[PDB]
Structure 1
Amino acid sequence: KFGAISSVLNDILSRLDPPEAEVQIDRLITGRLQSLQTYVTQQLIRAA
């Protein structure tokens, strides 16, 4: 969840108005971006 109400975009969109949906969605965006970045860094280190 990364501090958001839910881990599903559709529920956040169907339960809140857009102004609050945006602030709820940015947190998921940041968390998933961090996950991808960590994965890629580990992959590079292994490839070396």
Structure 2
Amino acid sequence: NTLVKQLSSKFGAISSVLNDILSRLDPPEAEVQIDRLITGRLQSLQTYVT
């Protein structure tokens, strides 16, 4: 349940939903925000697996 809940975390991003990031921001800014979400989700997966 924790791992699923982590999908709703922003990790500092303006939004947790990738489609919102892609819709409102130009590719460059969207790429920065998405890369941040990717980092946060990878950290959550590493924690879960450990």
- With the shorter chain as reference, the TM-score category is 0.7 to 0.9
Larger gyration radius, structure 1 or structure 2: 1
Runs of at least 4 residues of structure 1 off by over 4 A?
none
Listed as ranges, the gaps of 5+ residues in structure 2 are 1-9
Give the distance between the partners of 1:32 and 1:14, measured in 2 at CA.
21
Q: How many residues align?
A: 41
Query: With structure 2 as the length reference, what TM-score do the two structures score?
Result: 0.79
Identity %: 100
Listed as ranges, the gaps of 5+ residues in structure 1 are 42-48
Give the distance between the partners of 1:19 and 1:32, measured in 2 at CA.
20
Compute the RMSD of aligned alpha carbons.
0.4
Query: With structure 1 as the length reference, what TM-score do the two structures score?
Result: 0.82
- Bigger relative contact order, structure 1 or 2, given CA contacts below 8 A and separation 6+? 2
